[PDB]
Design an enzyme around this catalytic site. Structure first.
Site, mmCIF file in Angstrom:
data_model
loop_
_atom_site.group_PDB
_atom_site.id
_atom_site.type_symbol
_atom_site.label_atom_id
_atom_site.label_comp_id
_atom_site.label_asym_id
_atom_site.label_seq_id
_atom_site.Cartn_x
_atom_site.Cartn_y
_atom_site.Cartn_z
ATOM 1 N N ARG A 82 0.802 -1.218 0.000
ATOM 2 C CA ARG A 82 0.000 0.000 0.000
ATOM 3 C C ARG A 82 0.840 1.276 0.000
ATOM 4 O O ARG A 82 0.439 2.296 -0.582
ATOM 5 C CB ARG A 82 -0.841 0.077 1.279
ATOM 6 C CG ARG A 82 -1.507 -1.203 1.763
ATOM 7 C CD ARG A 82 -2.289 -0.821 3.034
ATOM 8 N NE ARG A 82 -1.276 -0.713 4.095
ATOM 9 C CZ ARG A 82 -1.635 -0.391 5.333
ATOM 10 N NH1 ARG A 82 -2.922 -0.175 5.536
ATOM 11 N NH2 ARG A 82 -0.762 -0.293 6.320
ATOM 12 N N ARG A 86 9.131 -0.412 -2.810
ATOM 13 C CA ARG A 86 10.080 -0.870 -1.833
ATOM 14 C C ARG A 86 9.301 -1.094 -0.519
ATOM 15 O O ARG A 86 9.922 -1.582 0.417
ATOM 16 C CB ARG A 86 11.256 0.027 -1.467
ATOM 17 C CG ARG A 86 12.275 0.227 -2.578
ATOM 18 C CD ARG A 86 13.137 1.427 -2.236
ATOM 19 N NE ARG A 86 13.877 1.874 -3.412
ATOM 20 C CZ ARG A 86 14.370 3.088 -3.591
ATOM 21 N NH1 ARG A 86 14.223 4.027 -2.664
ATOM 22 N NH2 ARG A 86 15.026 3.369 -4.711
ATOM 23 N N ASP A 89 8.493 -6.034 -1.135
ATOM 24 C CA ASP A 89 9.136 -6.773 -2.185
ATOM 25 C C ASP A 89 9.169 -8.276 -1.851
ATOM 26 O O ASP A 89 9.670 -8.618 -0.786
ATOM 27 C CB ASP A 89 10.555 -6.272 -2.295
ATOM 28 C CG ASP A 89 10.713 -4.918 -2.932
ATOM 29 O OD1 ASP A 89 9.881 -4.521 -3.755
ATOM 30 O OD2 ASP A 89 11.718 -4.283 -2.541
ATOM 31 N N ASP A 91 10.516 -11.829 -3.475
ATOM 32 C CA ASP A 91 11.353 -12.400 -4.493
ATOM 33 C C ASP A 91 11.540 -13.912 -4.256
ATOM 34 O O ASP A 91 11.899 -14.350 -3.182
ATOM 35 C CB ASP A 91 12.716 -11.729 -4.515
ATOM 36 C CG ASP A 91 12.677 -10.396 -5.249
ATOM 37 O OD1 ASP A 91 12.766 -10.468 -6.486
ATOM 38 O OD2 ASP A 91 12.560 -9.361 -4.574
HETATM 39 MG MG LIG Z 1 11.688 -7.772 -6.032
#
Ligand SMILES: [Mg+2]
Ligand SMILES: [Cl-]
Ligand SMILES: [Cl-]
Ligand SMILES: [Cl-]
Ligand SMILES: [Mg+2]
Ligand SMILES: [Mg+2]
EC number: 2.7.6.3
Length: 152
Positions: A82, A86, A89, A91
Site C-alpha cells: 500500500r 520498496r 518486495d 522475491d
Molecule cells: Mg523484487
C-alpha cells in the site's frame, strides 16, 4: 515443492504489511508456510534520511509451478504493498532444486549469493542448504564477509 521467498520492506512501521504478505503467501492455493525467519534490519542505500529496511525469508511448500508462484507473489505485492515501491518486495530465491532461466523468472535469484539480507534469514531457516551448483549456504556465509544483521 519447497520454495524460499525473500521479503523486504522499507517502511518505518513495516509489520502490518509484512505480516499481511506472509498471511497471503500461506493462503496461496495448494501451498502453505513451512517456516518464517526472524525479521532483520538493514541500513538504507542512499544518503538521504530514510528508514531502515526489514528483511526476512519464508519457506513455502507449494504444488504450483514456479511461474504460477511468481504470479501470486506479484499479486500479493500489488494488493498488500500500500505504501508504494520498496514498501513490499517479494522475491523467489530458490524453488526446489530447479534451475530456471526464463523471461520472467530466474532461479536461483540472480544476485542472492551477494546479498546478506537474503542469505542470513535464509540460513536461519535452512542452515544445511546447498545450492544447485553444490555451494553450501553455510560456507558462502563463512567465506564471504557479510555483515551480521541485527533483529528488527
Ligand atoms: Mg523484487
Ligand atoms: Cl491474499
Ligand atoms: Cl485475491
Ligand atoms: Cl547455484
Ligand atoms: Mg494454505
Ligand atoms: Mg562460486
Amino acid at each position: 515443492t519447497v520454495a524460499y521467498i525473500a521479503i523486504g520492506s522499507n517502511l518505518a512501521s513495516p509489520l502490518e504489511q509484512v505480516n499481511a504478505a506472509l498471511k497471503a503467501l500461506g493462503d496461496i492455493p495448494e501451498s502453505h508456510i513451512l517456516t518464517v525467519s526472524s525479521f532483520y534490519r538493514t541500513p538504507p542505500l542512499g544518503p538521504q534520511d530514510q528508514p531502515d529496511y526489514l528483511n526476512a525469508a519464508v519457506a513455502l511448500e507449494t504444488s504450483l509451478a514456479p511461474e504460477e508462484l511468481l504470479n501470486h507473489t506479484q499479486r500479493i505485492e500489488l494488493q498488500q504493498g500500500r505504501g508504494g515501491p520498496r514498501t513490499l518486495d517479494l522475491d523467489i530465491m530458490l524453488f526446489g532444486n530447479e534451475v530456471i532461466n526464463t523471461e520472467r523468472l530466474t532461479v536461483p535469484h540472480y544476485d542472492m549469493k551477494n546479498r546478506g539480507f537474503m542469505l542470513w534469514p535464509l540460513f536461519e531457516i535452512a542452515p544445511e542448504l546447498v545450492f544447485p551448483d553444490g555451494e553450501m549456504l553455510r560456507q558462502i556465509l563463512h567465506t564471504r564477509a557479510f555483515d551480521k544483521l541485527n533483529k528488527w
